[PDB]
Amino acid sequence: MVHRVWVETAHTHGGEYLKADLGYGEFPELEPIAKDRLHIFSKPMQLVTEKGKENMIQRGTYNYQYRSNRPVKDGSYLVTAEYQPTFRSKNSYCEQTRMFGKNIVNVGHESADTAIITKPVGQNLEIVPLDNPANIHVGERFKVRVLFRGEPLPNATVTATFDGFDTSDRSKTHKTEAQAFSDTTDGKGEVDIIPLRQGFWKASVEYKADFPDQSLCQKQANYTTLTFQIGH
Amino acid sequence: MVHRVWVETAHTHGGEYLKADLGYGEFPELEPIAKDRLHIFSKPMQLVTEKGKENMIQRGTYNYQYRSNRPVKDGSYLVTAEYQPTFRSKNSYCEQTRMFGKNIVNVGHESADTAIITKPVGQNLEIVPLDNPANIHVGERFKVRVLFRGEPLPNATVTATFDGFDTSDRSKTHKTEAQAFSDTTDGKGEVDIIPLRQGFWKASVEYKADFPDQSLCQKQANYTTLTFQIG
Numbered sequence: 001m002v003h004r005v006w007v008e009t010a011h012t013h014g015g016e017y018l019k020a021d022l023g024y025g026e027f028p029e030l031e032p033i034a035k036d037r038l039h040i041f042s043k044p045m046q047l048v049t050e051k052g053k054e055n056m057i058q059r060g061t062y063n064y065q066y067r068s069n070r071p072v073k074d075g076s077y078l079v080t081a082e083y084q085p086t087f088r089s090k091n092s093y094c095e096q097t098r099m100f101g102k103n104i105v106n107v108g109h110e111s112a113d114t115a116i117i118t119k120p121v122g123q124n125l126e127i128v129p130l131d132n133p134a135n136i137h138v139g140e141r142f143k144v145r146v147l148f149r150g151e152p153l154p155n156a157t158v159t160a161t162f163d164g165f166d167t168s169d170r171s172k173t174h175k176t177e178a179q180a181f182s183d184t185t186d187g188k189g190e191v192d193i194i195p196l197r198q199g200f201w202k203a204s205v206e207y208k209a210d211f212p213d214q215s216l217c218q219k220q221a222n223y224t225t226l227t228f229q230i231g232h
Numbered sequence: 233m234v235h236r237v238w239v240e241t242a243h244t245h246g247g248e249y250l251k252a253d254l255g256y257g258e259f260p261e262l263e264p265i266a267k268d269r270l271h272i273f274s275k276p277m278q279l280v281t282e283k284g285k286e287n288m289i290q291r292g293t294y295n296y297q298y299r300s301n302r303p304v305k306d307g308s309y310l311v312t313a314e315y316q317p318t319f320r321s322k323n324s325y326c327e328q329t330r331m332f333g334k335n336i337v338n339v340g341h342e343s344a345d346t347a348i349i350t351k352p353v354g355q356n357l358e359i360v361p362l363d364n365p366a367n368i369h370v371g372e373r374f375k376v377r378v379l380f381r382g383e384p385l386p387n388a389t390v391t392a393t394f395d396g397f398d399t400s401d402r403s404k405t406h407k408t409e410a411q412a413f414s415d416t417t418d419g420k421g422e423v424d425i426i427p428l429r430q431g432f433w434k435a436s437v438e439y440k441a442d443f444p445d446q447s448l449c450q451k452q453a454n455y456t457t458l459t460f461q462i463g
Protein backbone atom coordinates (compact mmCIF):
# COMPACT_ATOMS: atom_id res chain seq x y z
CA MET A 1 0.00 0.00 0.00
CA VAL A 2 1.23 3.46 -0.86
CA HIS A 3 0.77 5.70 2.15
CA ARG A 4 -0.46 9.27 1.72
CA VAL A 5 -0.95 12.22 4.08
CA TRP A 6 -4.25 13.95 4.84
CA VAL A 7 -5.81 15.87 7.74
CA GLU A 8 -9.16 15.45 9.47
CA THR A 9 -10.72 17.84 11.98
CA ALA A 10 -13.59 17.24 14.38
CA HIS A 11 -16.71 19.37 14.14
CA THR A 12 -15.82 22.30 16.38
CA HIS A 13 -17.66 25.27 17.90
CA GLY A 14 -16.37 28.53 19.29
CA GLY A 15 -14.88 28.17 22.75
CA GLU A 16 -13.82 24.52 22.54
CA TYR A 17 -10.46 23.02 21.67
CA LEU A 18 -9.84 22.11 18.04
CA LYS A 19 -9.27 18.36 17.68
CA ALA A 20 -7.41 17.15 14.59
CA ASP A 21 -6.02 13.89 13.21
CA LEU A 22 -2.98 13.25 11.03
CA GLY A 23 -3.88 10.59 8.49
CA TYR A 24 -0.88 8.69 7.16
CA GLY A 25 -2.05 5.73 5.11
CA GLU A 26 -5.12 5.02 2.99
CA PHE A 27 -7.89 7.62 3.19
CA PRO A 28 -10.10 7.82 5.14
CA GLU A 29 -8.79 5.22 7.60
CA LEU A 30 -6.73 6.88 10.33
CA GLU A 31 -3.84 4.79 11.63
CA PRO A 32 -1.18 5.23 14.33
CA ILE A 33 2.18 6.24 12.91
CA ALA A 34 4.38 3.15 13.12
CA LYS A 35 7.58 2.98 15.16
CA ASP A 36 9.79 3.06 12.05
CA ARG A 37 7.90 6.08 10.65
CA LEU A 38 7.98 8.48 13.63
CA HIS A 39 11.09 10.24 12.30
CA ILE A 40 9.16 11.24 9.17
CA PHE A 41 6.59 13.21 11.19
CA SER A 42 9.16 14.99 13.35
CA LYS A 43 7.24 18.28 13.40
CA PRO A 44 3.71 18.67 14.80
CA MET A 45 0.69 19.66 12.74
CA GLN A 46 0.11 23.41 12.51
CA LEU A 47 -2.97 25.55 13.08
CA VAL A 48 -3.15 28.62 10.83
CA THR A 49 -5.22 31.58 12.06
CA GLU A 50 -5.08 35.39 11.85
CA LYS A 51 -1.89 35.43 13.94
CA GLY A 52 -0.23 32.98 11.54
CA LYS A 53 1.02 29.45 12.16
CA GLU A 54 1.26 27.80 15.56
CA ASN A 55 2.14 24.26 16.58
CA MET A 56 -0.59 21.97 17.85
CA ILE A 57 -0.08 19.62 20.82
CA GLN A 58 0.00 15.85 20.30
CA ARG A 59 -2.64 14.79 22.85
CA GLY A 60 -4.79 11.67 22.82
CA THR A 61 -5.02 7.89 22.89
CA TYR A 62 -3.23 7.59 19.53
CA ASN A 63 -0.15 9.44 18.33
CA TYR A 64 -1.96 10.90 15.30
CA GLN A 65 -4.28 12.96 17.54
CA TYR A 66 -3.63 16.67 18.09
CA ARG A 67 -5.38 19.58 19.76
CA SER A 68 -5.02 23.33 19.54
CA ASN A 69 -3.01 24.93 22.33
CA ARG A 70 -5.91 27.23 23.25
CA PRO A 71 -9.66 27.17 22.62
CA VAL A 72 -10.47 28.61 19.22
CA LYS A 73 -12.96 31.33 18.33
CA ASP A 74 -15.47 31.17 15.50
CA GLY A 75 -13.72 31.50 12.16
CA SER A 76 -12.26 29.66 9.19
CA TYR A 77 -8.81 28.18 9.78
CA LEU A 78 -6.30 25.77 8.29
CA VAL A 79 -4.71 22.66 9.78
CA THR A 80 -1.56 21.53 7.98
CA ALA A 81 0.51 18.34 8.16
CA GLU A 82 3.81 17.42 6.54
CA TYR A 83 5.72 14.26 5.66
CA GLN A 84 9.29 15.48 6.16
CA PRO A 85 11.64 14.84 3.22
CA THR A 86 12.95 11.29 2.92
CA PHE A 87 15.53 9.92 0.48
CA ARG A 88 15.48 6.50 -1.17
CA SER A 89 17.34 4.70 -3.94
CA LYS A 90 15.45 3.71 -7.08
CA ASN A 91 16.12 2.18 -10.50
CA SER A 92 19.98 3.86 -9.94
CA TYR A 93 19.17 7.35 -8.65
CA CYS A 94 18.18 9.20 -5.48
CA GLU A 95 14.60 10.36 -4.97
CA GLN A 96 13.32 12.71 -2.27
CA THR A 97 9.72 12.24 -1.15
CA ARG A 98 7.65 14.99 0.48
CA MET A 99 3.94 14.96 1.29
CA PHE A 100 1.56 17.65 2.50
CA GLY A 101 -1.94 17.82 3.89
CA LYS A 102 -4.24 20.75 4.53
CA ASN A 103 -7.71 20.79 6.08
CA ILE A 104 -10.16 23.69 5.93
CA VAL A 105 -11.99 23.90 9.27
CA ASN A 106 -14.97 26.21 9.83
CA VAL A 107 -15.46 26.74 13.57
CA GLY A 108 -19.06 27.88 13.96
CA HIS A 109 -22.08 26.99 11.85
CA GLU A 110 -22.13 30.27 9.89
CA SER A 111 -18.35 30.69 9.50
CA ALA A 112 -17.43 31.03 5.82
CA ASP A 113 -14.49 33.44 5.88
CA THR A 114 -11.76 33.45 3.24
CA ALA A 115 -9.02 35.75 4.61
CA ILE A 116 -6.98 32.96 6.20
CA ILE A 117 -7.78 29.90 4.10
CA THR A 118 -7.00 31.56 0.75
CA LYS A 119 -3.44 32.53 1.70
CA PRO A 120 -0.65 30.09 0.75
CA VAL A 121 1.10 28.51 3.73
CA GLY A 122 4.35 27.67 1.93
CA GLN A 123 3.96 23.96 1.12
CA ASN A 124 6.35 22.85 -1.62
CA LEU A 125 3.31 21.52 -3.49
CA GLU A 126 0.13 23.16 -2.24
CA ILE A 127 -3.60 23.32 -2.97
CA VAL A 128 -4.83 26.83 -2.13
CA PRO A 129 -8.64 27.21 -1.95
CA LEU A 130 -9.92 30.36 -3.64
CA ASP A 131 -13.29 30.14 -1.85
CA ASN A 132 -14.70 28.71 1.32
CA PRO A 133 -16.20 25.23 0.71
CA ALA A 134 -19.09 26.04 3.07
CA ASN A 135 -20.58 28.14 0.24
CA ILE A 136 -20.46 25.25 -2.26
CA HIS A 137 -23.58 23.16 -2.80
CA VAL A 138 -23.70 19.87 -4.67
CA GLY A 139 -23.05 20.42 -8.37
CA GLU A 140 -21.55 23.88 -7.89
CA ARG A 141 -17.92 24.79 -8.57
CA PHE A 142 -15.24 25.14 -5.86
CA LYS A 143 -12.17 26.88 -7.27
CA VAL A 144 -8.66 25.98 -6.09
CA ARG A 145 -5.16 26.85 -7.29
CA VAL A 146 -2.15 24.52 -7.32
CA LEU A 147 1.23 25.98 -6.39
CA PHE A 148 4.64 24.35 -6.82
CA ARG A 149 7.66 26.11 -5.30
CA GLY A 150 5.48 29.19 -4.91
CA GLU A 151 4.38 29.43 -8.56
CA PRO A 152 1.13 28.28 -10.20
CA LEU A 153 1.44 24.78 -11.65
CA PRO A 154 -0.42 24.33 -14.96
CA ASN A 155 -1.60 21.03 -16.47
CA ALA A 156 -1.50 19.18 -13.13
CA THR A 157 -4.18 16.58 -12.43
CA VAL A 158 -6.39 17.27 -9.41
CA THR A 159 -8.64 14.39 -8.37
CA ALA A 160 -11.18 14.37 -5.57
CA THR A 161 -13.20 11.82 -3.62
CA PHE A 162 -15.26 11.64 -0.45
CA ASP A 163 -15.49 9.38 2.58
CA GLY A 164 -17.92 6.62 1.61
CA PHE A 165 -17.71 6.88 -2.18
CA ASP A 166 -15.74 3.63 -2.56
CA THR A 167 -16.22 1.09 0.24
CA SER A 168 -17.01 -2.27 -1.38
CA ASP A 169 -14.67 -5.04 -0.19
CA ARG A 170 -12.05 -2.76 1.36
CA SER A 171 -9.33 -4.68 3.18
CA LYS A 172 -5.61 -4.46 3.90
CA THR A 173 -5.11 -5.68 0.29
CA HIS A 174 -7.94 -4.15 -1.77
CA LYS A 175 -8.69 -1.00 -3.81
CA THR A 176 -11.06 1.79 -2.67
CA GLU A 177 -9.09 4.45 -4.56
CA ALA A 178 -11.94 5.54 -6.85
CA GLN A 179 -12.35 9.29 -7.33
CA ALA A 180 -15.58 11.23 -7.88
CA PHE A 181 -13.78 14.07 -9.69
CA SER A 182 -10.77 14.63 -11.94
CA ASP A 183 -9.58 17.63 -13.95
CA THR A 184 -6.39 19.46 -14.93
CA THR A 185 -5.25 22.94 -13.93
CA ASP A 186 -5.17 25.84 -16.39
CA GLY A 187 -2.39 28.35 -17.07
CA LYS A 188 -3.15 30.15 -13.80
CA GLY A 189 -2.86 26.88 -11.86
CA GLU A 190 -6.60 26.87 -11.13
CA VAL A 191 -9.31 24.22 -11.36
CA ASP A 192 -12.96 23.93 -10.28
CA ILE A 193 -13.80 20.90 -8.14
CA ILE A 194 -17.43 19.93 -8.73
CA PRO A 195 -18.76 17.78 -5.86
CA LEU A 196 -21.78 15.58 -6.58
CA ARG A 197 -22.37 14.50 -2.96
CA GLN A 198 -22.14 16.06 0.47
CA GLY A 199 -19.58 14.76 2.93
CA PHE A 200 -15.90 14.67 3.89
CA TRP A 201 -13.92 15.36 0.72
CA LYS A 202 -10.24 14.97 -0.15
CA ALA A 203 -8.66 16.52 -3.24
CA SER A 204 -5.28 15.23 -4.39
CA VAL A 205 -2.46 16.39 -6.64
CA GLU A 206 1.03 14.98 -7.17
CA TYR A 207 4.08 16.33 -8.93
CA LYS A 208 7.35 14.61 -9.81
CA ALA A 209 10.22 16.87 -10.85
CA ASP A 210 13.99 17.26 -10.73
CA PHE A 211 15.56 17.82 -7.34
CA PRO A 212 17.01 21.37 -7.20
CA ASP A 213 20.59 20.47 -6.18
CA GLN A 214 21.58 17.79 -8.71
CA SER A 215 24.88 17.22 -6.89
CA LEU A 216 23.00 15.70 -3.93
CA CYS A 217 19.82 14.07 -5.28
CA GLN A 218 18.22 13.58 -8.69
CA LYS A 219 14.41 13.39 -8.43
CA GLN A 220 11.67 14.70 -6.15
CA ALA A 221 8.14 13.36 -5.66
CA ASN A 222 5.44 15.48 -4.00
CA TYR A 223 1.99 14.31 -2.89
CA THR A 224 -0.42 16.97 -1.64
CA THR A 225 -3.94 16.78 -0.27
CA LEU A 226 -6.72 19.21 0.67
CA THR A 227 -9.58 18.05 2.88
CA PHE A 228 -12.87 19.87 3.42
CA GLN A 229 -16.58 19.47 4.09
CA ILE A 230 -19.35 19.77 1.51
CA GLY A 231 -22.75 20.39 3.04
CA HIS A 232 -23.77 20.55 6.68
CA MET B 233 -8.78 22.28 -28.96
CA VAL B 234 -7.96 18.65 -28.26
CA HIS B 235 -10.43 16.76 -30.46
CA ARG B 236 -11.36 13.34 -29.31
CA VAL B 237 -13.61 10.64 -30.78
CA TRP B 238 -16.84 9.34 -29.26
CA VAL B 239 -20.06 7.76 -30.54
CA GLU B 240 -23.70 8.64 -29.89
CA THR B 241 -26.84 6.73 -30.86
CA ALA B 242 -30.36 8.11 -30.93
CA HIS B 243 -33.18 6.45 -29.01
CA THR B 244 -34.12 3.48 -31.21
CA HIS B 245 -37.07 1.12 -30.97
CA GLY B 246 -36.93 -2.25 -32.70
CA GLY B 247 -37.64 -2.41 -36.42
CA GLU B 248 -36.73 1.20 -37.27
CA TYR B 249 -33.51 2.73 -38.57
CA LEU B 250 -30.68 3.06 -36.04
CA LYS B 251 -29.31 6.60 -36.33
CA ALA B 252 -25.81 7.11 -34.92
CA ASP B 253 -23.44 10.07 -34.70
CA LEU B 254 -19.67 10.40 -34.95
CA GLY B 255 -18.37 12.88 -32.39
CA TYR B 256 -15.00 14.41 -33.27
CA GLY B 257 -14.13 17.30 -30.98
CA GLU B 258 -15.16 18.35 -27.48
CA PHE B 259 -17.74 16.07 -25.87
CA PRO B 260 -20.71 16.25 -25.82
CA GLU B 261 -21.02 18.75 -28.70
CA LEU B 262 -21.17 17.16 -32.15
CA GLU B 263 -19.59 19.08 -35.02
CA PRO B 264 -19.22 18.63 -38.79
CA ILE B 265 -15.96 16.93 -39.71
CA ALA B 266 -13.86 19.65 -41.33
CA LYS B 267 -12.45 19.39 -44.85
CA ASP B 268 -8.78 18.96 -43.77
CA ARG B 269 -9.94 16.10 -41.47
CA LEU B 270 -12.12 13.98 -43.80
CA HIS B 271 -9.21 11.70 -44.73
CA ILE B 272 -8.92 10.72 -41.06
CA PHE B 273 -12.35 9.07 -41.13
CA SER B 274 -11.96 7.12 -44.37
CA LYS B 275 -13.94 4.13 -43.07
CA PRO B 276 -17.55 4.38 -41.86
CA MET B 277 -18.72 3.54 -38.36
CA GLN B 278 -19.65 -0.10 -37.74
CA LEU B 279 -22.71 -1.73 -36.20
CA VAL B 280 -21.92 -4.90 -34.24
CA THR B 281 -24.77 -7.40 -33.92
CA GLU B 282 -25.18 -11.19 -33.89
CA LYS B 283 -24.12 -11.40 -37.54
CA GLY B 284 -20.92 -9.58 -36.54
CA LYS B 285 -19.62 -6.26 -37.83
CA GLU B 286 -21.38 -4.39 -40.63
CA ASN B 287 -20.69 -1.01 -42.19
CA MET B 288 -23.07 1.89 -41.69
CA ILE B 289 -24.08 4.39 -44.36
CA GLN B 290 -23.20 8.08 -44.00
CA ARG B 291 -26.73 9.46 -44.43
CA GLY B 292 -28.07 12.70 -43.01
CA THR B 293 -27.99 16.48 -42.80
CA TYR B 294 -24.40 16.58 -41.49
CA ASN B 295 -21.39 14.48 -42.46
CA TYR B 296 -21.11 12.93 -38.97
CA GLN B 297 -24.52 11.23 -39.19
CA TYR B 298 -24.74 7.52 -39.98
CA ARG B 299 -27.75 5.30 -40.61
CA SER B 300 -27.96 1.53 -40.37
CA ASN B 301 -28.28 -0.51 -43.55
CA ARG B 302 -31.46 -2.44 -42.73
CA PRO B 303 -33.59 -1.77 -39.64
CA VAL B 304 -32.52 -3.46 -36.43
CA LYS B 305 -34.24 -5.96 -34.15
CA ASP B 306 -34.51 -5.56 -30.39
CA GLY B 307 -31.27 -6.27 -28.57
CA SER B 308 -27.98 -4.90 -27.28
CA TYR B 309 -25.49 -3.82 -29.94
CA LEU B 310 -22.26 -1.89 -30.40
CA VAL B 311 -21.54 1.11 -32.61
CA THR B 312 -17.81 1.55 -33.19
CA ALA B 313 -15.90 4.43 -34.77
CA GLU B 314 -12.23 4.93 -35.57
CA TYR B 315 -9.80 7.80 -36.15
CA GLN B 316 -7.50 6.22 -38.75
CA PRO B 317 -3.78 6.31 -37.84
CA THR B 318 -2.09 9.64 -38.49
CA PHE B 319 1.58 10.58 -38.12
CA ARG B 320 3.14 13.78 -36.83
CA SER B 321 6.44 15.18 -35.61
CA LYS B 322 6.92 16.08 -31.94
CA ASN B 323 9.68 17.19 -29.58
CA SER B 324 12.43 15.26 -32.70
CA TYR B 325 10.40 12.08 -33.24
CA CYS B 326 7.39 10.55 -34.99
CA GLU B 327 4.15 9.83 -33.14
CA GLN B 328 1.22 7.85 -34.55
CA THR B 329 -2.21 8.82 -33.22
CA ARG B 330 -5.18 6.43 -33.24
CA MET B 331 -8.56 6.99 -31.59
CA PHE B 332 -11.54 4.71 -31.03
CA GLY B 333 -15.15 5.10 -29.97
CA LYS B 334 -17.70 2.53 -28.91
CA ASN B 335 -21.34 3.11 -27.99
CA ILE B 336 -23.56 0.59 -26.22
CA VAL B 337 -27.00 0.81 -27.85
CA ASN B 338 -30.03 -0.95 -26.35
CA VAL B 339 -32.68 -1.28 -29.07
CA GLY B 340 -36.04 -1.61 -27.32
CA HIS B 341 -36.90 -1.01 -23.68
CA GLU B 342 -36.23 -3.95 -21.29
CA SER B 343 -33.42 -5.09 -23.61
CA ALA B 344 -30.26 -5.69 -21.58
CA ASP B 345 -28.35 -8.46 -23.34
CA THR B 346 -24.70 -9.12 -22.58
CA ALA B 347 -23.86 -11.48 -25.46
CA ILE B 348 -22.70 -9.04 -28.14
CA ILE B 349 -21.68 -5.99 -26.11
CA THR B 350 -19.22 -7.90 -23.88
CA LYS B 351 -17.23 -9.22 -26.86
CA PRO B 352 -14.04 -7.39 -27.90
CA VAL B 353 -14.37 -5.88 -31.37
CA GLY B 354 -10.58 -5.68 -31.78
CA GLN B 355 -9.67 -2.04 -31.16
CA ASN B 356 -5.98 -1.36 -30.55
CA LEU B 357 -7.02 0.24 -27.26
CA GLU B 358 -10.49 -0.92 -26.23
CA ILE B 359 -12.93 -0.58 -23.34
CA VAL B 360 -14.97 -3.79 -23.09
CA PRO B 361 -18.12 -3.54 -20.92
CA LEU B 362 -18.46 -6.59 -18.67
CA ASP B 363 -22.15 -5.89 -18.02
CA ASN B 364 -25.05 -4.10 -19.63
CA PRO B 365 -25.49 -0.47 -18.47
CA ALA B 366 -29.26 -0.99 -18.38
CA ASN B 367 -28.76 -2.87 -15.08
CA ILE B 368 -26.67 -0.13 -13.42
CA HIS B 369 -28.47 2.34 -11.16
CA VAL B 370 -26.90 5.49 -9.75
CA GLY B 371 -24.37 4.53 -7.10
CA GLU B 372 -23.91 0.98 -8.41
CA ARG B 373 -20.78 -0.38 -10.06
CA PHE B 374 -20.36 -0.85 -13.83
CA LYS B 375 -17.42 -3.17 -14.48
CA VAL B 376 -15.36 -2.70 -17.65
CA ARG B 377 -12.06 -4.12 -18.89
CA VAL B 378 -9.28 -2.28 -20.74
CA LEU B 379 -7.48 -4.15 -23.52
CA PHE B 380 -4.33 -2.93 -25.27
CA ARG B 381 -3.24 -4.99 -28.29
CA GLY B 382 -5.66 -7.74 -27.27
CA GLU B 383 -4.23 -8.11 -23.77
CA PRO B 384 -5.58 -6.69 -20.48
CA LEU B 385 -3.99 -3.36 -19.60
CA PRO B 386 -3.16 -2.96 -15.88
CA ASN B 387 -2.79 0.32 -13.98
CA ALA B 388 -4.55 2.26 -16.75
CA THR B 389 -6.46 5.39 -15.75
CA VAL B 390 -10.13 5.22 -16.73
CA THR B 391 -12.13 8.41 -16.27
CA ALA B 392 -15.79 9.13 -16.85
CA THR B 393 -18.06 12.15 -17.24
CA PHE B 394 -21.64 12.78 -18.32
CA ASP B 395 -23.47 15.28 -20.52
CA GLY B 396 -24.22 18.22 -18.23
CA PHE B 397 -21.53 17.74 -15.57
CA ASP B 398 -19.24 20.49 -16.92
CA THR B 399 -21.05 23.37 -18.63
CA SER B 400 -18.31 25.95 -19.25
CA ASP B 401 -16.01 27.33 -21.95
CA ARG B 402 -17.17 27.97 -25.51
CA SER B 403 -13.71 28.14 -27.06
CA LYS B 404 -11.78 30.35 -24.58
CA THR B 405 -9.65 27.38 -23.39
CA HIS B 406 -10.92 24.36 -25.33
CA LYS B 407 -9.49 22.31 -22.47
CA THR B 408 -10.66 18.75 -21.87
CA GLU B 409 -13.87 18.48 -19.87
CA ALA B 410 -14.00 17.79 -16.14
CA GLN B 411 -14.54 14.16 -15.17
CA ALA B 412 -17.00 12.83 -12.60
CA PHE B 413 -15.03 9.60 -12.07
CA SER B 414 -11.47 8.28 -12.18
CA ASP B 415 -9.81 5.02 -11.15
CA THR B 416 -7.06 2.62 -12.23
CA THR B 417 -7.48 -0.84 -13.72
CA ASP B 418 -6.43 -3.84 -11.62
CA GLY B 419 -4.18 -6.73 -12.69
CA LYS B 420 -6.94 -8.14 -14.92
CA GLY B 421 -7.39 -4.77 -16.63
CA GLU B 422 -10.79 -4.29 -14.97
CA VAL B 423 -12.31 -1.34 -13.12
CA ASP B 424 -15.71 -0.43 -11.65
CA ILE B 425 -17.21 2.84 -12.90
CA ILE B 426 -19.46 4.37 -10.25
CA PRO B 427 -21.89 6.86 -11.85
CA LEU B 428 -23.27 9.46 -9.43
CA ARG B 429 -25.84 10.81 -11.92
CA GLN B 430 -28.19 9.54 -14.57
CA GLY B 431 -27.59 10.63 -18.14
CA PHE B 432 -25.42 10.05 -21.19
CA TRP B 433 -21.98 8.97 -19.97
CA LYS B 434 -18.59 8.79 -21.66
CA ALA B 435 -15.69 6.81 -20.21
CA SER B 436 -12.17 7.46 -21.46
CA VAL B 437 -8.76 5.81 -21.41
CA GLU B 438 -5.54 6.74 -23.19
CA TYR B 439 -2.33 4.78 -23.60
CA LYS B 440 0.98 6.03 -25.00
CA ALA B 441 3.62 3.45 -25.87
CA ASP B 442 6.49 2.69 -28.21
CA PHE B 443 5.51 2.14 -31.81
CA PRO B 444 5.95 -1.54 -32.79
CA ASP B 445 8.17 -0.95 -35.83
CA GLN B 446 10.86 1.40 -34.52
CA SER B 447 12.28 1.80 -38.04
CA LEU B 448 9.11 3.62 -39.19
CA CYS B 449 7.89 5.61 -36.17
CA GLN B 450 8.83 6.04 -32.52
CA LYS B 451 5.69 6.66 -30.43
CA GLN B 452 2.02 5.73 -30.51
CA ALA B 453 -0.85 7.50 -28.74
CA ASN B 454 -4.25 5.86 -28.28
CA TYR B 455 -7.43 7.59 -27.10
CA THR B 456 -10.48 5.38 -26.55
CA THR B 457 -13.98 6.14 -25.28
CA LEU B 458 -17.06 4.13 -24.36
CA THR B 459 -20.43 5.89 -24.28
CA PHE B 460 -23.58 4.57 -22.61
CA GLN B 461 -26.78 5.54 -20.80
CA ILE B 462 -27.38 5.41 -17.04
CA GLY B 463 -31.00 5.53 -15.91
Ligand SMILES: [Zn+2]
Nearest residue numbers: 011012013109
Ligand atom coordinates in the same frame (compact mmCIF):
# COMPACT_ATOMS: atom_id res chain seq x y z
ZN1 LIG C 1 -22.56 21.77 15.54
Ligand SMILES: [Zn+2]
Nearest residue numbers: 243244245341
Ligand atom coordinates in the same frame (compact mmCIF):
# COMPACT_ATOMS: atom_id res chain seq x y z
ZN1 LIG D 1 -38.91 4.82 -25.94
